[PDB]
Amino acid sequence: ARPTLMPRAQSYKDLTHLPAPTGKIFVSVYNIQDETGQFKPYPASNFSTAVPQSATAMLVTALKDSRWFIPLERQGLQNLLNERKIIRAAQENIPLQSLTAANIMVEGSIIGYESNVKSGGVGARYFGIGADTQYQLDQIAVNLRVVNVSTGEILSSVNTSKTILSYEVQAGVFRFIDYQRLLEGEVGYTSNEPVMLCLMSAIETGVIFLINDGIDRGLWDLQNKAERQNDILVKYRHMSVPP
Amino acid sequence: ARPTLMPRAQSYKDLTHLPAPTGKIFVSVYNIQDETGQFKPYPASNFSTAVPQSATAMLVTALKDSRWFIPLERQGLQNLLNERKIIRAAQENIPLQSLTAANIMVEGSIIGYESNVKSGGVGARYFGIGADTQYQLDQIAVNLRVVNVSTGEILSSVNTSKTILSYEVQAGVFRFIDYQRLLEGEVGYTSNEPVMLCLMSAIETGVIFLINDGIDRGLWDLQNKAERQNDILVKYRHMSVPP
Amino acid sequence: ARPTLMPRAQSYKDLTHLPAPTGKIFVSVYNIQDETGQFKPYPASNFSTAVPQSATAMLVTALKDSRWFIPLERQGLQNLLNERKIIRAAQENIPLQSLTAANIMVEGSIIGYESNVKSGGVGARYFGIGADTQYQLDQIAVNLRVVNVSTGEILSSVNTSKTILSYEVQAGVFRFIDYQRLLEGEVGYTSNEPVMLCLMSAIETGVIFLINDGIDRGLWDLQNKAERQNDILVKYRHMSVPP
Amino acid sequence: ARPTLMPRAQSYKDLTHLPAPTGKIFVSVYNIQDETGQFKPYPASNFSTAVPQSATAMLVTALKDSRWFIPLERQGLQNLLNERKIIRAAQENIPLQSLTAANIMVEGSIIGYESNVKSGGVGARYFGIGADTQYQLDQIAVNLRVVNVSTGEILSSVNTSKTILSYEVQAGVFRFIDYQRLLEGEVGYTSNEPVMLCLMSAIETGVIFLINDGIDRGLWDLQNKAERQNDILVKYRHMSVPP
Amino acid sequence: ARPTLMPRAQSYKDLTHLPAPTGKIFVSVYNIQDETGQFKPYPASNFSTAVPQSATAMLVTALKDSRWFIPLERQGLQNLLNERKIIRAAQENIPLQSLTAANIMVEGSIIGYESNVKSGGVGARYFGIGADTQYQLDQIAVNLRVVNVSTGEILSSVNTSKTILSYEVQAGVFRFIDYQRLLEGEVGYTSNEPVMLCLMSAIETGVIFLINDGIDRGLWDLQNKAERQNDILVKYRHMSVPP
Amino acid sequence: ARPTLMPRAQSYKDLTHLPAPTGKIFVSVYNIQDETGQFKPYPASNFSTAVPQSATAMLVTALKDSRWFIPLERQGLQNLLNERKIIRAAQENIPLQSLTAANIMVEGSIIGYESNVKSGGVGARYFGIGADTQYQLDQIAVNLRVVNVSTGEILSSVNTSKTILSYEVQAGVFRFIDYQRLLEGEVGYTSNEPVMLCLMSAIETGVIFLINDGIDRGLWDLQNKAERQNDILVKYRHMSVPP
Amino acid sequence: ARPTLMPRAQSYKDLTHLPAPTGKIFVSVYNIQDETGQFKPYPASNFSTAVPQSATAMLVTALKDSRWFIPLERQGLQNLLNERKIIRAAQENIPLQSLTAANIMVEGSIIGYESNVKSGGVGARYFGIGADTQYQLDQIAVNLRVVNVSTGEILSSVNTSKTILSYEVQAGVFRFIDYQRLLEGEVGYTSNEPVMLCLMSAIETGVIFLINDGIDRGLWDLQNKAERQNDILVKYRHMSVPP
Amino acid sequence: ARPTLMPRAQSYKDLTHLPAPTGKIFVSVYNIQDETGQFKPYPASNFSTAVPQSATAMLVTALKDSRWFIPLERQGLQNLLNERKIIRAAQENIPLQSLTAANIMVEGSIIGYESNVKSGGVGARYFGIGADTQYQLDQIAVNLRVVNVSTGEILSSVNTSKTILSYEVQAGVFRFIDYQRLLEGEVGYTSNEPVMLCLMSAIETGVIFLINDGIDRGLWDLQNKAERQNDILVKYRHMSVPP
Amino acid sequence: GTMTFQFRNPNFGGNPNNGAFLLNSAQAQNSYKDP
Amino acid sequence: GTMTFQFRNPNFGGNPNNGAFLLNSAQAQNSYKDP
């Protein structure tokens, strides 16, 4: 096993190629709460949540590597304030600065995760040889809303989804060959799309949808606000009509 | 998998085409509480709620993209007030504004979700070939009430429902072809309507039902209050008689 | 799927056609508590409540659309008082009014929900062809009592029930046609009456029973208190003798 | 389905025909606690209580419609005191009265609910034709005690029971008719007595047992205390010897 | 179903025929705690307690109808003190008395409930005809101790038991009658002794054991303390030697 | 069994060979929270978390043995402050120093763990002899973000994953040898990659990704910041493009 | 059964033969928290933790019998401070000393326990006779970090593992001997390595790894710090490269 | 059944024959916490702990009947301090003494209990006759550490184990005797060693290991400290080398 | 491993479902006839 | 994967339900008769 990075989808390749803003905006992610209320079915555990409870830590990666936002640690904010209170007792025996303002914040939610949305499967088996293609298409959806903390106004509230493609291909044979002889064999491959990667890729879709819908409203301006030519913003403007 | 937006239903196409009001109304969504009290049956988890616990984050999208309301972040309000207290310690080393008034609020609930309301299925199978059409029609229902926070009066309290169409088509064959030869195959497709999208589409139905029932009562006026001609308001006035 | 309103029963058609009172009475619904203590049986989840925990949000619709009451938001009252405290910090940088008195309140309960009260089913099957009609008649019951909050006296305490008709018709055939040929097929339709709609329709029955039993006691007077002719009040006076 | 009133038993017909007292007594029902400690067996849910947790809301109906008591709302008393504190902030911008004294109170309990007390069933089946009569006789029991709140003395503490008759009649046939022909059919009817109605009818029995045992002790006097002729009081005096 | 009183056992017939004391003693029952720690087995629910959690409400009936004690409401004492605080705010706009002293109290417990203590069953079945008599003898036991609240001394602490007789008689036949003809039938009757009635009858046994063991110790004297002739006290003195 | 060290992967061999910085940075690990929300499926326990709840103790080893960070104990910080309060009462009968500043901190999460991501297996079995290779490829992913505690800014937030390779090779034979003689045998080996070692190796991957992405941003400088030649930093710079 | 000591592994024989330090260091073990989050699978209980929650009491034995540390009771520290407060009220009617400083502490964790890491088994069975060797190799891992409580710096943080060898050898025969005669027999032996002993032996490995990695860093010096010859320290220095 | 004492093992016979110390040491047992984290497997309950939660009450018996310690009640210390506060209100209407110092305390734990450590079984069965010997060797282990409460130093921390021998001998026959005649019979005896007695006997082993390891360290001296001849101390000194 | 001891044969207390396989196995491997 | 080791054959402690398939498999593939 080779421990590489997280296998980011196509939407992250549009995320790093976003144009630079006039200074990266200070932003704060408190708790993108897993309020899907959806746990994993059998054979998985009943207490096992179907999506991760970690979109507050995934969106931080989606806002930092976008080169558009400076995210602030507000998930373990009570874990950070316990560290700041130590430096108040450490220097009183560099002076400590204060936390930055973070004029906008991305509050949000994982708003849902219906198991087996467009699921299905084709099966075929002749004499002996046979194979099925069973795909269980899940669908996660996340909410990401930029909130001006100075006034409480929700600025751009978007809802992006991603269809988790969990397909299996089991090609199993059971065929007699000679008299009182039997060959059999079953090659099988179930490539579940990991829900953590589709939570990551739908959030990275939402960050582009936060930025593209944050430009036309005049909420924040990018550097050289005359182009509108890059194939990330115009692609996520043609994707701004929901199916 | 292509991470597009949330696949919004027909009711969202009526939502963005709503006429503009005389200034978008400041509104606040605290917690559209999932008090269905309904969890998902077997094979899904017992702790898995049957609808999402996220209608407080879905209605925010339904009020913001309606171009009628400016929603305020009140779901994680204690997460936003922890950010405002940081700026009080940040600027005392732009001045901070106050939160807006939000003269109306949309308190509400997901009032119910009966599993398998009008469920059923037809099955047919001749020699070998055979197919069934089994549909399990669920039904979500949401409550959305506009409450004047200055007086506590509930202004327009509507109840919109949506029938979740979860159908399966399994066309499975099991047929001998020659002597000691057997062909079989089962193509199957279960298109569950996702409960998060029907929670989203019944809420977007309710926002039009908040606006249309908020006009005749004189609660708020739209720009050019003489037309009454657009096929969103008169369609949701002919839909104002409940079946 | 067409997202219409909630499919209200016959009792709501009597509710909107109620005569107007001398001013709609300010009323407050705090928590119509689901104290059935009854959860859904197998195959549904054990934590899934058999009726919704949302009669405090359904009765609000039943009192508002009755054109007799102005309901007040008291379900999320601590969510509304957190909004009023914001306007106290917003205008001190229209003046804020106070909450209305609500001289009567409708406290109440969902008092019960016995599964399979008068359940049963007929089955018939000849050679091959066959069909059953299995109906599982549940029964919800709600309590709605008008309480004068100035004195604590319970004014009119009624108990309305509604039999949930959850019937299935499965017409399944299994018949040989030729030698080594077999036709089979099973058309099935289970129209469960949704418990949220029967919670809604028994509460709307109770609101008429609150109003009709609130007139003869002299608790409140309607406009033109001389008629007693409309077929809502005299129908719910002939229904005032419990079977 | 016709949403009528609660199908009250024979004991409620004796309840409304009770003679009038010298002024209806102010009484208060705080919490008739479901301390059966008895939940419903399989196939019903494990968290589903076998009787409702709502005898505090049923006895209110039994004391109000008896025309003997003015019940006071003490179930949601903290929900009523939150409304009285609003009127204290509403009129200080009719004067508010105080809550009445309620010199007696009916504290009580649902003291038990043994599943399948005198259960049983007869079965008979000849060639093909056959039918069973299986009845599962449950038994609820409630405690209703009138307590003088001025001195704490329990005045009349009665224990009334009611046998829940949950019978099924399944008449199922399975009979060959011709050579390689088979008729079958199963008509079935399980009329469970609803435990909410037997909780309601045993409490209404207890209210007559509160009144009849509240007369001979001299706790309260009725209007024209010389008759002792009506067939409610003398019937519930011949029923005062427990079997 | 006829809603009579609680079907009290033979021990209650000895309870009402107890001789009168020199004034009925003020006594208080706080919580006869169900600390059996015993829940009902399968098929009943796991959360369902095997005995009721209501011996604090049953003993109140056993002390009041004994014509020996005036019981005081101390189960919902915090529900009674919330009513007394209302009269303090009601008369300050008959004067309120104070709660009586209750010089003795009956603290106690349901000390145990072993399932299937002396259980067993005989079965017999000849050709076709057959019947069994299976009885599952449970055993409840309660503790009732009179405690002088002025000194904390436990005065008379008794332990009474009662064997719950839960017997079934299933007489099931399965007998061929002619060639290719079969008669069958199963008459069955399971008369479970209800655990609430045996909790009631063992407590009423304990009240006589509180009184009889409260006389020889000189704790309280009865009216005309010279007789010792009635067949309740001498029967419960010959029953004072435990088997 | 030989109790050696933890069997660290290839990524730890790159971790100790990292170049030295200009003084090891004081850093603090409070709680790398297991918010996968993912528990182990059957046959393992439902309460058993699928990854350890111990990444706050694993990252400490990954930052200390990297020779780049001086980690501070902040997991049991309330267990360490209870020890410091003892020395305040011990020396007042070496003087106690204060806790160091820890100008950066690594807050983070285990952001996900989808069971059976790219799982599958090939099976083959001829007459008697046969073997399968079933591999259940899990995937953990962790978030590690360096946060400047002086300003709250998240400096470098990376997401590293590792595919847990849990493969089984069962080579089972079942073959008749003579007439009424049968040889059989099943050699099996399931080498589950331990999730604690892949949590350890993906975190050690993240520490190199914290350091390599912490150099180009100018957050901290290493000793002799001119080389850029070692095959750890340039390997984890070619691994900085996520697949 | 002979109640001997705990059957300590080979690593404890290296533990007692460690060279003596210049005074045994005062150390404190608060809570070596079982944050494996891993419970035992079926057939064992779901609430049963897979490793003990007692490494805070095992490491105390590993530090005391090492003749290197004086451990302090900090597991039940609130149970020890309740005893010290008694002596403050006992002598005020030997003077009480204060708790020692414990300049270093061993905070730590059981960082993981993957069930069936390198599990597997060979099976062989001829005609009648047959035997299997199935071994389920678990793996515990513990973290032990010495923390200077005067500065909060984690001094030496090591991660030691131990493979729990749980093997079974079932030699079961099933063989006919004569005509209508059958001999069978199954000798079986499953020697599970107890997880408490492997938690004990991996911690005792960690204490040597705390001491050996605590010498080269200059954290503490041993008596006669010139030898480096004993086969405990050089063995646990050749074991300092993790596989 | 004869209610004798607890069937104490061989280690208690060495416990009472311990030599007397120079005054029995005042000692206090707060909570020997069951932190095995191990519950009983199926068929026993999941909430049933595999060892008792009562080693704080067993060690009290092991220290009192050793004639070496005066144990102090610290398990229900808050139950004893509620009694001392009563005597403060009783004598103020013998003077009350204070609690003794208890200069040492035995804090400790049940550190583990692996189910089926060295389990196994031999089975043999010829024609008809047959018997098995299946033994499931569990292993409890306890920690007992003497802590000087004046300084917090753990004085002697020992770990004693005991192998629970739970063996079954089922000798079951199934043999035809004549033509159409069959004799069968199964004598079975499962002598589980009770885990409460092995918790008791391993603790009594630990008390001798507390005393023997408390003598050579000079922590406390016995009467006539010159003998070293009794076969309890030299036996538990030859048992001081752990296997 | 946390692996208890169960027999593989139902006469000694193992899983009783393999007895329908165990006995018929030696019925398929006996090679013994009547004398 | 969290995949334990179970046998596929009931003589060694696997799932006992496949023995009704395992034995009859080699009863359908033996090709051995009496000498």
Coordinates of N, CA, C and O in Angstrom, one line a residue, chain A residues 32-36 51-52 54-56 58-59 62 106-113 139-145 156-164 195-207 209-210, chain B residues 3-8 54 57-58 61 196 200:
Chain A
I32 N -19.6 22.1 10.1 CA -20.5 21.7 9.0 C -21.1 20.5 9.5 O -20.6 19.4 9.3
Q33 N -22.3 20.6 10.2 CA -22.9 19.5 11.0 C -23.4 18.4 10.1 O -24.2 18.7 9.2
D34 N -23.0 17.2 10.4 CA -23.6 16.0 9.8 C -25.0 15.9 10.4 O -25.2 15.2 11.3
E35 N -26.0 16.6 9.8 CA -27.4 16.4 10.1 C -28.1 15.8 8.9 O -29.3 16.1 8.6
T36 N -27.5 14.8 8.2 CA -28.2 13.9 7.4 C -29.1 13.0 8.3 O -30.2 12.7 7.8
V51 N -22.4 9.1 6.2 CA -21.4 10.0 5.7 C -20.5 10.3 6.9 O -20.8 10.1 8.1
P52 N -19.2 10.9 6.7 CA -18.4 11.3 7.9 C -19.0 12.5 8.6 O -19.7 13.3 8.0
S54 N -17.3 15.0 9.5 CA -16.0 15.7 9.3 C -16.0 16.7 8.2 O -14.9 17.0 7.7
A55 N -17.2 17.2 7.8 CA -17.2 18.2 6.7 C -16.7 19.5 7.2 O -16.4 20.4 6.4
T56 N -16.7 19.7 8.5 CA -16.0 20.9 9.1 C -14.5 20.9 8.9 O -13.9 21.9 9.0
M58 N -13.2 18.9 6.2 CA -13.0 18.8 4.8 C -13.1 20.1 4.1 O -12.3 20.4 3.2
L59 N -14.1 20.9 4.5 CA -14.2 22.2 3.9 C -13.1 23.2 4.1 O -12.7 24.0 3.3
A62 N -10.9 22.5 1.5 CA -11.4 23.0 0.3 C -11.3 24.5 0.2 O -11.3 25.0 -0.9
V106 N -18.3 30.3 6.7 CA -19.0 29.2 6.0 C -19.6 28.3 7.0 O -19.0 27.3 7.4
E107 N -20.8 28.6 7.5 CA -21.6 27.7 8.2 C -22.3 26.8 7.1 O -22.3 27.2 6.0
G108 N -22.6 25.6 7.5 CA -23.3 24.7 6.5 C -23.6 23.4 7.1 O -23.6 23.2 8.3
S109 N -24.0 22.4 6.3 CA -24.5 21.1 6.7 C -24.2 20.1 5.5 O -24.1 20.5 4.4
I110 N -24.1 18.9 5.9 CA -24.4 17.8 5.0 C -25.9 17.5 5.1 O -26.4 17.0 6.1
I111 N -26.6 18.0 4.1 CA -28.1 18.1 4.2 C -28.8 16.8 3.9 O -30.0 16.7 4.1
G112 N -28.1 15.7 3.5 CA -28.8 14.5 3.2 C -27.9 13.4 2.5 O -26.9 13.7 1.8
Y113 N -28.4 12.2 2.7 CA -27.7 11.1 2.1 C -28.6 9.9 2.0 O -28.6 9.0 2.8
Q139 N -26.4 9.1 -3.0 CA -26.3 10.5 -3.3 C -26.2 11.3 -2.1 O -27.1 11.3 -1.2
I140 N -25.0 11.9 -1.9 CA -24.8 12.9 -0.8 C -25.2 14.2 -1.3 O -25.3 14.5 -2.5
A141 N -25.5 15.1 -0.4 CA -25.7 16.5 -0.7 C -25.3 17.4 0.5 O -25.5 17.0 1.6
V142 N -24.6 18.5 0.2 CA -24.1 19.4 1.2 C -24.6 20.8 1.0 O -24.9 21.2 -0.1
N143 N -24.7 21.5 2.1 CA -25.1 22.9 2.1 C -23.8 23.7 2.5 O -23.2 23.3 3.5
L144 N -23.5 24.7 1.8 CA -22.4 25.6 2.1 C -22.9 27.0 1.9 O -23.2 27.4 0.8
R145 N -23.1 27.8 3.0 CA -23.5 29.1 2.9 C -22.5 30.1 3.6 O -22.1 29.9 4.7
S156 N -24.5 33.7 0.2 CA -24.7 32.8 -1.0 C -24.8 31.4 -0.4 O -23.8 30.8 0.1
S157 N -26.0 30.8 -0.5 CA -26.3 29.5 0.1 C -26.6 28.6 -1.0 O -27.6 28.6 -1.7
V158 N -25.6 27.6 -1.3 CA -25.7 26.7 -2.4 C -25.9 25.3 -1.8 O -25.5 25.0 -0.7
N159 N -26.4 24.4 -2.7 CA -26.6 23.0 -2.4 C -26.1 22.2 -3.5 O -26.7 22.1 -4.6
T160 N -24.9 21.5 -3.3 CA -24.3 20.7 -4.3 C -24.4 19.2 -3.9 O -24.3 18.9 -2.7
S161 N -24.7 18.4 -4.9 CA -24.8 17.0 -4.7 C -23.8 16.2 -5.4 O -23.1 16.7 -6.3
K162 N -23.6 14.9 -5.1 CA -22.7 14.0 -5.8 C -23.2 12.6 -5.7 O -23.5 12.2 -4.6
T163 N -23.4 11.9 -6.8 CA -23.9 10.6 -6.8 C -22.7 9.6 -6.6 O -21.8 9.5 -7.4
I164 N -22.8 8.9 -5.4 CA -21.8 7.9 -5.0 C -22.1 6.7 -5.9 O -23.1 6.1 -5.8
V195 N -17.5 7.5 0.4 CA -18.4 8.6 0.7 C -17.6 9.8 1.3 O -18.0 11.0 1.1
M196 N -16.4 9.6 1.8 CA -15.5 10.7 2.3 C -15.0 11.4 1.1 O -14.7 12.6 1.2
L197 N -14.8 10.8 -0.1 CA -14.2 11.4 -1.2 C -15.3 12.2 -2.0 O -15.1 13.2 -2.6
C198 N -16.5 11.7 -1.9 CA -17.7 12.4 -2.5 C -18.2 13.5 -1.6 O -18.8 14.4 -2.1
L199 N -18.0 13.3 -0.3 CA -18.2 14.5 0.6 C -17.2 15.5 0.3 O -17.4 16.7 0.3
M200 N -15.9 15.1 0.0 CA -14.9 16.1 -0.3 C -15.1 16.7 -1.7 O -14.8 17.9 -1.8
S201 N -15.6 16.0 -2.7 CA -15.7 16.5 -4.0 C -16.9 17.3 -4.2 O -16.9 18.3 -5.0
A202 N -18.0 17.1 -3.4 CA -19.2 17.9 -3.5 C -19.0 19.2 -2.7 O -19.6 20.2 -3.0
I203 N -18.1 19.2 -1.7 CA -17.8 20.4 -1.0 C -16.9 21.3 -1.8 O -17.1 22.5 -1.9
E204 N -15.9 20.7 -2.5 CA -15.0 21.4 -3.4 C -15.8 21.9 -4.6 O -15.5 23.0 -5.2
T205 N -16.9 21.3 -5.0 CA -17.9 21.8 -6.0 C -18.6 23.0 -5.3 O -18.8 24.0 -6.0
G206 N -18.9 22.9 -4.0 CA -19.6 24.0 -3.4 C -18.8 25.3 -3.2 O -19.3 26.4 -3.2
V207 N -17.4 25.1 -3.0 CA -16.5 26.2 -2.8 C -16.4 27.0 -4.1 O -16.4 28.3 -4.1
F209 N -18.9 27.0 -6.2 CA -20.2 27.6 -6.2 C -20.4 28.7 -5.2 O -21.3 29.5 -5.3
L210 N -19.6 28.7 -4.1 CA -19.5 29.8 -3.2 C -18.9 31.0 -3.9 O -19.3 32.2 -3.7
Chain B
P3 N -20.0 15.9 -10.3 CA -20.6 16.6 -9.2 C -21.3 17.9 -9.6 O -20.7 19.0 -9.5
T4 N -22.5 17.8 -10.0 CA -23.3 18.9 -10.4 C -24.0 19.5 -9.1 O -23.7 19.2 -8.0
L5 N -25.0 20.4 -9.3 CA -25.7 21.0 -8.2 C -26.7 20.0 -7.7 O -26.8 18.8 -8.2
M6 N -27.6 20.4 -6.7 CA -28.6 19.5 -6.3 C -29.7 19.4 -7.4 O -30.1 20.5 -7.9
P7 N -30.1 18.2 -7.8 CA -31.1 18.1 -8.9 C -32.5 18.6 -8.5 O -33.4 17.8 -8.1
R8 N -32.7 19.9 -8.5 CA -33.9 20.5 -8.0 C -35.1 20.2 -8.9 O -34.9 20.0 -10.1
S54 N -32.2 18.3 8.4 CA -31.5 19.4 7.8 C -32.5 20.4 7.1 O -32.0 21.0 6.1
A57 N -31.5 23.9 7.1 CA -30.5 24.3 6.1 C -31.0 24.2 4.7 O -30.4 24.8 3.8
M58 N -32.1 23.5 4.4 CA -32.6 23.4 3.1 C -33.5 24.6 2.8 O -33.5 25.2 1.7
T61 N -31.8 27.7 1.7 CA -31.6 27.7 0.2 C -32.9 28.0 -0.5 O -32.8 28.7 -1.6
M196 N -34.1 13.6 0.6 CA -33.5 14.9 0.7 C -34.0 15.8 -0.4 O -34.1 17.1 -0.2
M200 N -36.5 18.9 -0.1 CA -36.1 20.2 -0.7 C -37.2 20.7 -1.6 O -37.5 21.9 -1.6

